[PDB]
Symmetry: D2
Amino acid sequence: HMRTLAVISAGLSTPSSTRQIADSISEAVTAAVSARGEALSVSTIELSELIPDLMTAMTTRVHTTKLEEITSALSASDGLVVATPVFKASYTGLFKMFFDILDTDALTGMPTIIAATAGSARHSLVLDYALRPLLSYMRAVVVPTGVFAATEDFGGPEGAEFNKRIARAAGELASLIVEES
Amino acid sequence: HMRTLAVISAGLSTPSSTRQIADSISEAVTAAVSARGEALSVSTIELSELIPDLMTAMTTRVHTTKLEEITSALSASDGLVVATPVFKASYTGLFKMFFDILDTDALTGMPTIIAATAGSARHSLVLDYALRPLLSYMRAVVVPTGVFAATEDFGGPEGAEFNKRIARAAGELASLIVEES
Amino acid sequence: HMRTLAVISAGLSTPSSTRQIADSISEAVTAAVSARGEALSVSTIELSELIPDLMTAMTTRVHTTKLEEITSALSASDGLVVATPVFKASYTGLFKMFFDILDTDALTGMPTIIAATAGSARHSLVLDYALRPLLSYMRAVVVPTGVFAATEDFGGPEGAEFNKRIARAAGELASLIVEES
Amino acid sequence: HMRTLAVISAGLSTPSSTRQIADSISEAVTAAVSARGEALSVSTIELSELIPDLMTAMTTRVHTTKLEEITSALSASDGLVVATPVFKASYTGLFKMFFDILDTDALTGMPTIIAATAGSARHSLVLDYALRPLLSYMRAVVVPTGVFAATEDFGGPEGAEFNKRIARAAGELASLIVEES
């Protein structure tokens, strides 16, 4: 039935480092699901392009049609990847807002990889102290390998060890994805 | 020179529980600064009324005039009170977004009381694991007594012990406010 | 081969509320693994009875024989349950110490249920902001349903909804346990 | 009356990086209190030398005499500095245990600098997500500048910017210390 992977990116710049790693991860997840013998369809959503819809959802309990279809598709997905820039030592307000807008049971059981990017790695704990508690509150199953891209640390032993990590996170998710019947 | 107190409320409903306690706190802070012999001018900002400006700041590095004046007034204040509803077991995306929009040194040294509201008190730790790290990252000095309003727990011994707490938090802030020359 | 479940309890009092729920959970896990057609052997360790060994491990890199066998058994287990009292708004120093003493890869992939107990539920977020980050740092897979026993909230609708939760957490773990070949 | 500064170090190795920075900080605090015209008496406690007393306090509600005098001196201090190594992505079990052993009101109002050390800085958020919530729960007033020593980052622009930070944290504390009458 072709496995489905939703990806939520919350970067604001162009190019977006957030979208960069979100892509690195989703590409890796496709590679892993392929290795497990299946095809993976990845649908990415850039939150900066849902601003008016989110702004509307704040001043009107009713969601636009565009938003209603996006969250519905999300809940229907087999796997999920979420990525965010680090603003004020944590996830982005826009990022959180998207999740605020979701129904309580929107991600129950949802296999998920949490990711974040920044210059250095001093704020990498944002993964376990911010995103993890969030996806956990929503009963999603967040794989152990969280991905934190420190732009300043790409290339060399570090960079290669990092790509090794993205693959590891990808495998964990891929395994959970092909497991669902 | 009349001490100034900025108050950021992020509730969305009307009436707003968030604004309710934000008021309870600011009233208490005025009472405490009065006791220390001075007058306190409290300027409250409802974030739900800055939505278009925040939505604009997300898709344009330039802030509106209305927003530019609000953040400037904020940084100029003597004290600060921040209040938020608890969405998805943490602060509101709109709340965070407001802070994302601030300059790095916007609140350096700013005396502050962090507050949050919800039905029960099971998510009260959001004060130390969400708001505290945030205002701390911005080098603001957050008073020890954080205020968490559990609507279900108003009235009776609890309610009276709570009002006692708001006064305590108010005193801590008031002391810091009249200290600045 | 009879599935194995390790249980780490860190209570100090007798009776121990911590051991009480640790038992409630392990009993529930046995019931769930039984329903999936298998037998579950549960080995519980009371940390208060490993004090001298832990005290020794702090002043001597070498672990006692009793401790060496306990951690080895742990790593070999199919599933894990960890429970702790809430001291100073977080997990117990003794609890943490036990984990400090473990090898870096001691719990990699380990299916786990995190649990904690206290009078009220105001410190229930300790599960996602303390224990979750900890077991996650050790690459253990912590099931979504964390268990927080608020002694004051036993019995009635709450209590019955709670037992419902323990069963839910038990199922998540049981599923992961019978999955390992 | 000569201002008093208590220092709790929880390192286990010798030399202790933890004690190293704990000293760097306390030296800086003495320098700052001197600049404000006073003398600072610094009493440092190495937790690894209180192990038997802590081990005893776990299996006996009664504290040894040595421990009773140490906590009493602590509560009587004008300022406090706490430092810890990072084990399993957070503070040390021994560190926490020391605080578990304290009376609820032992540090109310206590001016404090929180510090931690590790090779890299990827776990620096432990300051705001672990130590801050802890000292805050005890109503101590933790200065904004937390100190995180990343051994790998000493020397050069970073190292010099770091020493600049320690001085900043020292000033915040020193100001609070000479303020108490």
